[PDB]
Design a binder for this molecule. Structure first.
Ligand SMILES: Nc1ncnc2c1ncn2[C@@H]1O[C@H](COP(=O)(O)OP(=O)(O)O)[C@@H](O)[C@H]1O
Ligand SMILES: Nc1ncnc2c1ncn2[C@@H]1O[C@H](COP(=O)(O)OP(=O)(O)O)[C@@H](O)[C@H]1O
Ligand SMILES: Nc1ncnc2c1ncn2[C@@H]1O[C@H](COP(=O)(O)OP(=O)(O)O)[C@@H](O)[C@H]1O
Ligand SMILES: Nc1ncnc2c1ncn2[C@@H]1O[C@H](COP(=O)(O)OP(=O)(O)O)[C@@H](O)[C@H]1O
Ligand SMILES: Nc1ncnc2c1ncn2[C@@H]1O[C@H](COP(=O)(O)OP(=O)(O)O)[C@@H](O)[C@H]1O
Ligand SMILES: [Mg+2]
Ligand SMILES: [Mg+2]
Ligand SMILES: [Mg+2]
Ligand SMILES: [Mg+2]
Ligand SMILES: [Mg+2]
Lengths: 371, 371, 371, 371, 371
């Protein structure tokens, strides 16, 4: 039979079937609830809205994200979202399709324990498996060597792999991703007089960010150019017809990835994190790691991010080494693509967590069965 | 020489001289214009009235506030008010006294740019400086550690400071202040048959609010007590001799600070905003922030507001931490007091924005010179 | 006159006077610098903090260790720390007191060359000397026979001595010490949901480790016991009032000493290193080495480390030999104690590196004068 | 038919066919096993790697040498290496080719007994023979008189032969060879800040040693020259792009052959060992031994070793005697060359240990059949 | 007064006083010097160790024998040993006690000349005398007829005496003694995997030899028995706790006395040497020589040596003659016993070499005064 692949990200939900080349269902990972009082009678109004329906009537709802920083904080909302994916989007019965789930490294173990418990108790999937997203990204890339820089909506992590062997002591994690960039853009848009406060306005700011932001090759020169001329200014139209203009905020927002101190964080940029992860590996494998930098996730879709990353890593690495940044045009769904590839493998079918094993071993089977 | 300190708030204007302990001039920040047709000849009537004069003949004028939400919307009226303060109230020549101005955080930059331009072009002040009101409140408090909750007439903001170092990523702003409370009281007074519509009636309602309103320690119990008995009812006399009676509207109006949903806002209460600002700071400085909650502004003068804030924050913070709310009896003028203290410092005299620097660097000198 | 003894470790600084039985000054070897922007004026804030002062205001500073793995990487910070020790802690003038310094074996020679250059040029000490820390530990033990296992914050080394004669071909070194254990504990605390990232949080994790960790006599049995029951779980209170609970991480962290593969190292455990060092010595001196195992350093202060070491070495050594582990209660300062003992010897005064010898022979005099 | 010649050294394996002038297969004598955890599925990864394959993926493996000091310590690994040589390198069937093996003198007898047992039981060679490596070196030299100084990777031995007659009472052995030199170079490279610890780093250090080391004609003068000038310094590039610089360590490493006390050994140098072996022979044969010093093995390939040996022996021997050191350019494979020559002799075919003799006489036939 | 008797052997020193029945001081004839570098200060370490003190700290010293083959090769070490005997062992003043010394026959004359010169110049003995050790052995035996077979540590000699008359043309000498046996045992212990190389390991091997070796009555039958069964195998415990097992090496080592070709010597066995010495005497004295074979020295203390000697000589001598081997249980000190007996004789006091005779006749007086 066919197996389901679900990539439960912080912001988006990517669901589909193993063997396909693109997710069947992609929609925001939000749940909305009304915040006003209803006066019409017989409208058949619901008490909650999930996905694109919540984004539709977002002017009267309060939107909540069940996942923050790759960690599920609301489990009732997560069950609602999983039910939505399984019934109203994929339109399948989760009793005959094994389901493949993803998770960021260095997460709490209770997260995956509860994921397995919900999958086997609330739903009746015959088997399930939890895979590291960077491994799936490297599967999608078609290679078995390289360090993967995955940046989605909640977390950013690096995982180096040499010959199918992972070096877990060199895995580095960062709680700086797209949502922090959206909040920073919201904060810095107030300098021009634009005030976005509500969650619906947060969605507006997210759309502005993902439609008008880019990474500058040289930050100081770009700031000087923006200050001098006005060619970098762009206009955006609000839903009510108002037009706002954005100048240096276009590239000041993605700059937080390379200078996390813009949002009060002491951590290092993504380039320095990648270099530190590489330098924690064996000296004989560093050359192949320098030439196989793989990027994945929505936050890696900014224009000019790959060139900036290559420039920074070249400035860090020695001159003799060759630095290659591998950013496929479909890296926004590379985790799901690799998950589908892994679930479609003939030799992978012996590593599913079957129902009998879960019943005999409790929810702790996931730790020993899954890396 | 002596330097001027001007606290241009949304509702009130606090002006005076550095080194004093109280503002010299305090008057409403309104400009009035006649709305009827004159029949007497030779009365020497003016076309505009500023300050207490407008409040005197408010039965024949239309009153306008030049500032909404800490942002100056009318600049001709603001110039009129500044001229009033400099000539008819302080009775000084603004050419030999440096002037210290205040501004709320996260305001548009054009606001302070135009403030500097007006101060250096319309008037001829030798130097000027713009300071954050929360920093001045902490100066007045006599301490260099703590989170300040300033609530005036247009805005409410929180600014945490540990050892003279501000954490700008933890600053939170709220466009809910005294004017919204006055509008809400006007709206809810119609339930008893009292209809106030005009701007002069808005001043009447503001006086009723600031003379008869208080914050309830427990809102539901207070509502039950008001419904059961009649001891909470108070009487107010209108200018024409009519007497109105107010019941649960006395504490239903200030409750909007802790439940902003009463006026259709999705934001969180002041207690939750303070807790969120504290939790955005470093873990090693949170203990000193919990014990140094400083309140300032006119909107913090409601009876029982400090006890309610302490109760809510204690309910939010862990049991081991000690919560102290610092509400001095003179917190209505603490911003001006701190501004005077800062302007009277010997080591502060090197940070004035002199006329030559403004001339060479344009109106953009304020951003680099002032935090 | 009196001579100074300074034990410049990776984590701690132990300074004092020769002839005493305890260091006069002990404080962390860190330098902190502000990472936020200051708003108060006239606070007299400094640009750097050294020692306990940095640990005080660690919520607003970035902390750096000038020494990694017993090698000084930052020399300006090291000069700052030495100035701190000489002036603000010992309160003496380093021009009439000869200073005794310590260093780990198999260090770069430029390290001690620059140490001598700084001591004779930046300061004006009349004489100085560099001693191996294991020799000082054996001096403190009061015996002249035995192999010393010194483990501080950056390095772990073994040095066997028979009759005052060292066997340098049997000296073994290991770059696994307390800082690696702190990093491993930080990494494995994320499994329970606790995220410590900043340097101040690194200090928090170090305190948790040194107040709640121990060495298990049998690792697998301890893991089984921790999995079955909950008697091994302990609670710790964070500075902000939050309480965290630690289970098997209490003994999983010190286990890295005996199984260095937990942090991706191919090296052997401390017991195997000690056995290999003993087996590299002459057959006629091995019996006295088996019965004189001396431990020193802070990393040797874990509960149950001595019993585990004895058990492992007994399992390695032949049955007839007698294994004794000598772990005095004051082994945390045994290097300093032995240095004081050596500096107080009457027959040692002829081996100081005087100023004239340094002037005539350059900084290379340390190699020929010191072992 | 053709007979196989296998020179199982400590570091290298030299295999081929009798009658040829060069070994067919030369590769390191190592077996590698993974030390990390695999995450890719379907890679077809092996559990062990032998030879150059282990040297390829050495950044993720732990490398072990089955032979130390000419003595086989691991027999499963030795069987793996023999299978590799017989199948993946020579690509022959070891059932119709008699195999000639080599062994150092004064080895344990169980070593050759087990070699014969493995050759006749695990494989089915029709016949086999064990020859002394010095005799094969003298065969390759084309002469039947002289003392042979063979130094490979584990052992160094001297064997004097006059007219085809060996003097076994004058054979001298030394457990100081290339591996000790590699370990010493690793130890003394830490003085410049370079730290090599892992087995792969041991291979790196071995490459540095065999590409940058030489024997100084006069050690003290060379040390003075290296200290004074900098013309003796050379640079080496690490696999990750880092560049290291080596000074007097180039000739300080090979000096251990003439001064074994550098690594804590009480033995005498190779020159003194050769002189002592010569002086243990009859007085009438010493003159021909002085003029037929033959060197063999990889450790004899250092530049300037032959001149130094001649100088030392001339200083030891009387003035009238003539000292000649015979170091052919192909002495790295002279043992294999002599073994091929011996196996290709028509008169040697009667001294093979046939299968019937082994079956009737047990594994002890090797002692009586082979010298 | 009392006279001193000193038996300066190759391995042992036997000193005492004339008239006693056992030597007062017996200790090894070695001098040790440190070979490592000292790190402790104030240990009062010496630069040389003599006797049992050298055997104590032999794991850090290099041991040298001043005497090889009964010939003194190092004279500074010999002076050190003589000073040790005279002061730290006998505790007497060598100025009032005449000293009796011993020497092997057919030694260089310069040996005894320098012995006399040292005794009369470095020390101030009133008189001295050099006696042949075989004559002293025959004195100890209490008879004046017979051939003496003395075998110590360096030499083996035969001296036949008939009626107090020596036949110097029949004296035979052999440079095969205990030290050669120790070296042979060291060489043949490598066949079982035991490697002893250092001088301290030479002492270990000497102890093993003198505690586990014996002479086989029939060598070939003993070899067959050892090969067949395992009852001849014995175990020995090394100082570090390791246990070694010795089989046919127990009797293969003493066999070198009867088959000197085992160590590459062309000479004849001790039995054949004794027979040849007897056959060089007059035919009328051979019968009394056949029946008075006297053995002395440590090398004659092997079990079964006397029976083997009797069997061999009986096989050589004609059937009618009666062969008696006289091996007293105290033959290890028979030379010293006979020297004491000779020095205690009243009629011997006229043959001392007085100081005046030495002064007038130079060091050559010993040749004419002593046989
Ligand atoms: N073209 C784009 N440019 C910049 N940011 C983008 C773009 N597309 C998506 N993003 C950001 O990436 C995030 C989605 O990343 P995704 O890979 O779905 O994360 P997750 O794996 O956690 O679901 C969104 O928050 C969005 O703001
Ligand atoms: N005693 C009081 N009780 C309740 N509200 C008050 C009281 N005094 C003043 N206010 C309110 O506070 C506002 C003035 O606050 P102020 O600090 O002057 O604001 P700003 O700093 O913007 O001028 C007025 O709108 C008034 O309604
Ligand atoms: N009681 C304890 N238990 C476990 N670890 C400890 C204890 N006390 C100190 N340590 C660790 O030992 C280190 C200090 O060791 P120290 O001997 O000062 O090293 P150094 O000689 O390099 O200064 C610290 O990093 C600390 O984490
Ligand atoms: N050109 C060279 N210079 C110095 N050392 C070398 C050189 N070539 C090889 N070696 C050393 O010699 C050793 C190989 O010697 P080899 O004769 O193969 O020993 P074996 O007979 O035990 O296999 C290696 O360990 C290597 O370090
Ligand atoms: N019981 C014994 N069995 C075998 N050999 C012995 C025994 N006792 C001593 N020896 C050997 O005899 C030697 C000592 O002989 P000794 O008579 O002291 O010689 P010397 O007269 O030259 O000092 C030692 O080298 C020792 O190895
Ligand atoms: Mg994702
Ligand atoms: Mg204000
Ligand atoms: Mg230390
Ligand atoms: Mg070889
Ligand atoms: Mg003797």
């Amino acid at each position: 039979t066919t197996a389901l692949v679900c990539d439960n990200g912080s912001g988006l939900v990517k669901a589909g079937f193993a063997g396909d080349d693109a997710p069947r269902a992609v929609f925001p990972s939000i749940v909305g609830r009304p915040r006003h009082q209803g006066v019409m009678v017989g409208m058949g109004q619901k008490d909650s809205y999930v996905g694109d329906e919540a984004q539709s009537k977002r002017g009267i709802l309060t939107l909540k994200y069940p996942i923050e920083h790759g960690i599920i904080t609301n489990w009732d909302d997560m069950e609602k979202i999983w039910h939505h994916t399984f019934y109203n989007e994929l339109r399948v019965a989760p009793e005959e399709h094994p389901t493949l789930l993803t998770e960021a490294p260095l997460n709490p173990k209770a997260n995956r324990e509860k994921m397995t418990q919900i999958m086997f108790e609330t739903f009746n999937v015959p088997a399930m498996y939890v895979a590291i997203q960077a491994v799936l990204s490297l599967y999608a890339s078609g290679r078995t060597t390289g360090i993967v820089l995955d940046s989605g909506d909640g977390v950013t992590h690096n995982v180096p792999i040499y010959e199918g062997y992972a070096l877990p002591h060199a895995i580095m994690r960062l709680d700086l991703a797209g949502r922090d960039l959206t909040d920073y853009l919201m904060k810095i848009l107030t300098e021009r007089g634009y005030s976005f406060v509500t969650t619906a306005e947060r969605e507006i700011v997210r759309d502005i960010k993902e439609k008008l932001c880019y990474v500058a090759l040289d930050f100081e020169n770009e700031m000087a150019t923006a200050a001098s001329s006005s060619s970098l200014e762009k206009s955006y139209e609000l839903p009510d017809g108002q037009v706002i203009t954005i100048g240096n905020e276009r590239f000041r927002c993605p700059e937080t990835l390379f200078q996390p101190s813009f949002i009060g964080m002491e951590s290092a940029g993504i380039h320095e994190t990648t270099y530190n992860s590489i330098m924690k590996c064996d000296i004989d494998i560093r050359k192949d790691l320098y030439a196989n930098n793989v990027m994945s996730g929505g936050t890696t879709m900014y224009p000019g991010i790959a060139d900036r990353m290559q420039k920074e890593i070249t400035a860090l690495a020695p001159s003799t080494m060759k630095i290659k940044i591998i950013a496929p045009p479909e890296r926004k769904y590379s985790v799901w693509i690799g998950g589908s590839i892994l679930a479609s493998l003939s030799t992978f079918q012996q590593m599913w967590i079957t129902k009998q094993e879960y019943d005999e071993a409790g929810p702790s089977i996931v730790h020993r069965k899954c890396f």
